[PDB]
Symmetry: C3
Subunit: 480 residues, 3 copies
């Protein structure tokens, strides 16, 4: 069976609308990729070591894929998924065989589009992945990964990535990032500040996180005023690594505006070990405001990623640990939650906040009204389960009416799967084009406006929001 | 004015999409109906007595219809709706006359589609229902009901129903199901286990339910371990009557994982008469887990139907009683709610749970993320008010990207109106055809995949999910 | 760059569906405007004084426009927005300049459609608004407002408005309405009862509104039984001014059924000064039921507009005050909330309630199942942030299947911007035509049904629902 990957995919069937869409996408398809939020390993580009298997690249590290298979009765051992006891005994060929046999599950899901984009456009496959085709797929991409063109830096250059952001905590060292810039390569690989491990006292890996947060900053992190200094010192070390943004994956969008003493008192109680869910929530809430207060000084762009019920499968958390596809969205609140921070700093020009959600109902109700008013608020793209074609379309249909396009930030891939990056960004460009085309076709915007918009949405608006206009000296110049 | 019931109804207007839709539907339109959850009376097929009126068959027992009329100033006595004081004194012809004169209300509703299917396909009417057409409709339906071709069993065969499930509690007899099997007629009419009345202590008809639950089981029902034995024995009796499923219509999706002594303690308090809203919730929650623990042994597929505010009209509950169209959906939660059961049994191979909702906002947020991960969880079709062209489409648009298609169970009609069964299944088939057609037209799926999926969704997937693959000897063999 | 305002705007691109839409809209485009809920100033038509600037008419009063600009970093002083310290020192021409340079922000928003309608249809502009175009736009509409064709009364007649309802509290005078109905101009301008200031005790302007509520009624407003009489007497004065409606903008849709004695107990505590959030909520809850009980006698139609977290920007409330575009929607509940009122009066033929929402998730879940059952309940059109093409389409797509079309109430504009009224009503007619066309094209309704429906939805249904069938003798006959 052939792999048919149509040049006009994701555009609406209506030929009038499809013709407008294709023209808008034409203006935008070969523009460089700006990836200002993501979870790729910077040690891939630091060492420039090859990837080994198809499984180690596409199957084992991607939770979107092994979720579905786990959901249908397949063990994580059968797919070589990294356990807490280490990498399983399974043959990487046999792990791939199981995936290929279960590839039908992904029909109508965005993984069908992303992987077939990788298969047809990166590897040049001409047949569709099945059980009969499985081994041919395995050894042909294993062989491709051994070649010099499929080295991490070479792929970065081939994919036309202008900016790539990894996410690191304050307790981990930025040694791999230093290696990117002191090598002459010039690929603009940046970091972002995720202090979640030293902010969430209910995190099980928080005691060890605090311990190496002390090493990296050289401060008394168990006393409040030097805990804050430690954040300031580490933030500056991130800005020195090029970072322009901070990221905050809290369970809630809650913020608080405690006095310096009220915060210290709370900090003392939690460090003492008297950790209640109420105190831990309030500290996370106070830290959002505290991080924003530092952003007034150091100029970091603040991303809030709330609403994930992390580690919902308890039995899986014991056996395999974090990020194994069992993080489930919760209903999130913003109007009452963000009010304390917005009372203090909501009209401040020096602050920039980008809001994400796992709860689509808040789009037209809360997010678009808030962001269409507050100078500091901006709207991030549809995230996680919603970075799909239908989720992206719902975003545009529900957000634009009140917020407009200029109160959004564009798109990020938000992935560990490196090869899927051009695939994911392509999908975004086509869906934006489809939305914009429909506005032209229904005479809700002029074509001249639409042609200005995709270039803005794709390229200019991400760059302004993430303060990416100032390229460093160690990076390549920005060219079209 | 003519009854124009078009061949291309429910397909999108876009001609390229419409023609894919038409092609997929043709592959599926004449497949047998599998109806694994519903509320038809089993006595209809055991006695094979004819229906009497157009009013008694279409108007009086259907709450979808009299709701709208009651909503517009019509009394239920005017429409011959069974009161708590019995069947009203009004003329069935006059009841039909009022409905006919108010049939315009249903413009744009799915009942327009279902009833016009019944009028044009089942009865062969050629004119549209109006006030001046009313009497002609009444006596032509009534005359038709006297014929041998409109006997319940004869209609079951004409409709090409393969499997029909009814819904009984543990306190009622499986009298009519035994009579169906024992007869020469080979219709596969089965049952479903719905223990709601002996589980909800806040149910007003619970003390009488518990009383006859003791008669049907022969057990000490007001003592814990033998209340559980009474459930096991009754479930076995349902299995022997052909049941493959259980059904749970609780106010919430809440589950619990109490110890044996904690469960007995709570049970004893409620049996004593200390029914507090908190304790009644906890028992309904604990019983969800308890039914799943029984399902580990007997293989009953567990359907959860939560989130209905039953009997919202208090005045109507006093005068007429239950199921009179005053049950309003509530905001429903699944993530925290289902966690205690999923921690215990979420990764078990032997357990099969099907989740339904009245809260469409949980599709992309909670249900699909949960069902796209857990081995035990599957998604039921859009239910009740969302069992409709716009509703089924929203389900498919919001659920597919995370759960896929193979984590869904197809379609159930969930109706008492027997004549609307082929009408409702036809709507399911056209909307599914329309959705798949849009995937093909926008090149998000290959035609080959869509042709496979339409047949699976219609026939194979409802069969697998409801364990309908073993026909019993007392029914017909399954042919296309 | 030309101002191209296409004659088939807002209809779907699909040529067959579009052709149906165009035919349904043709049946309805020139019908008179029924505006059963709005916030226009009755003194405009009473005095018939002209409007001054482009800024004072279009930019400064409309919060949809200055929301977007403030959101991008523009000060409200730079846009001549009324502060608490009065009208700013800035030039109206220079305020217009800022808006014109930032008109690109409104791409994809309903403000694009409304304003270009005003620009092309009301004014006759031929070029698109830009920074280089700013000054020409300003003084050409400044000069047009001086002319006799653009006087409030002349525009009312030109726009073919049949009915206009304004919104007044019980503590203010209906002098301007009295001036309307005694002059020879036959424009049907009515009012609507909005008792929010004398019911919400957490309102900062409540103690002052209680004082003038006593003045206009001549009752002991600070004791329960005469407080209720003060409402009844003021409600009669509104009906004298032609009002058919009351409006209730509470934070919650909560209702209550307290006894006469529990209600007085609660009232007495709040008048004492013991205002707690729980007591204030319960009073707002009880007062909804009380207004409903009054509606059984005087026949007023009850509009519930819940869910707005008003004055979310604290610093802006202190500096500029109310209605400055910082009123954010909250999640709203209707099922448990409306139950105490519906247990008492849910089946009563004399009662009419119209339900609004700011929370689109309640449409298919709560609002349509409630309205598709209870004899008293009806659904108002998509409100505020949702009175827009995608919002109205989501409304129709989520409400119709359970509630039907006859449990809805048509459209209202809900606006201060008087020139935007025909624009907003046109959008409503185009989207309704679009939705009905899609039903016909998918053969879910017949064309005969759709042809009846847009005329009902546009004209007949709003009139029946707001009891606008009996024209008073001071107003022009409807034609
Ligand atoms: K599953
Ligand atoms: K109604
Ligand atoms: K903003």
């Amino acid at each position: 069976r052939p792999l048919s990957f149509h040049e006009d995919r994701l555009f609406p069937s209506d030929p009038a609308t499809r013709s407008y869409a294709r023209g808008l996408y034409a203006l935008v398809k070969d523009l460089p990729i700006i990836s200002p939020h993501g979870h790729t390993d910077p040690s891939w580009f630091a060492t420039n070591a090859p990837f080994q298997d198809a499984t180690d690249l596409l199957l084992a590290p991607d939770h979107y894929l092994f979720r579905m298979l786990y959901s249908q009765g397949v063990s994580l051992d059968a797919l070589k998924v990294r356990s807490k006891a280490g990498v399983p005994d399974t043959d990487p060929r046999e792990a791939w065989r199981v995936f290929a046999s279960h590839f039908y599950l992904f029909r109508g899901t965005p993984s069908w589009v992303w992987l077939n984009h990788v298969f047809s456009q990166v590897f040049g496959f001409t047949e569709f992945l099945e059980a009969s085709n499985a081994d041919d797929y395995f050894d042909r991409i294993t062989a491709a990964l051994a070649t010099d063109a499929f080295r991490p830096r070479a792929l970065f250059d081939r994919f036309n990535i202008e900016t790539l952001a990894t996410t690191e905590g304050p307790h981990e060292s930025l040694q791999h990032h230093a290696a990117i810039r002191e090598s002459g390569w010039g690929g603009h690989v940046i970091t972002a500040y995720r202090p979640d491990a030293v902010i969430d006292f209910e995190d099980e890996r928080s005691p060890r996180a605090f311990e190496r947060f002390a090493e990296t900053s050289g401060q008394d992190v168990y006393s409040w005023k030097s805990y804050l200094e430690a954040h300031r010192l580490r933030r500056q070390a991130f800005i020195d690594a090029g970072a322009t943004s901070s990221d905050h994956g809290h369970p809630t969008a809650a913020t608080a505006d405690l006095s310096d003493v009220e915060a210290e008192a709370l900090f003392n109680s939690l460090v003492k070990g008297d950790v209640t869910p109420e105190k831990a929530e309030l500290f996370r809430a106070q830290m959002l405001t505290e991080m924003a207060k530092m952003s007034l000084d150091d100029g970091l762009v603040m991303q809030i990623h709330p609403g994930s019920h992390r580690n919902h499968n308890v039995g899986l958390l014991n056996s395999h640990g974090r990020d194994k596809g069992a993080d489930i969205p919760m209903r999130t609140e913003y109007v009452d939650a963000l009010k304390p921070l917005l009372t203090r700093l909501g009209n401040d020009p020096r602050l920039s906040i980008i809001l994400f959600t796992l709860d689509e109902t808040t789009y037209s109700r809360e997010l678009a009204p808030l962001a269409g008013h507050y100078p500091v608020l901006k709207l991030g793209p549809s995230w996680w389960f919603h970075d799909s074609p239908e989720g992206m379309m719902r975003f545009r249909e529900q957000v634009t009416e009140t917020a407009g396009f200029y109160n959004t930030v564009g798109f990020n891939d938000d992935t560990r799967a490196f090869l899927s990056i051009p695939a994911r960004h392509d999908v975004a460009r086509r869906v934006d084009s489809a939305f914009l085309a429909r506005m032209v076709a229904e005479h809700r915007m002029d074509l001249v406006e639409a042609e200005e918009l995709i270039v803005d949405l794709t390229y200019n608006l991400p760059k302004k929001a993430y303060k990416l206009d100032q390229r460093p000296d160690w990076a390549r110049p920005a060219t079209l």
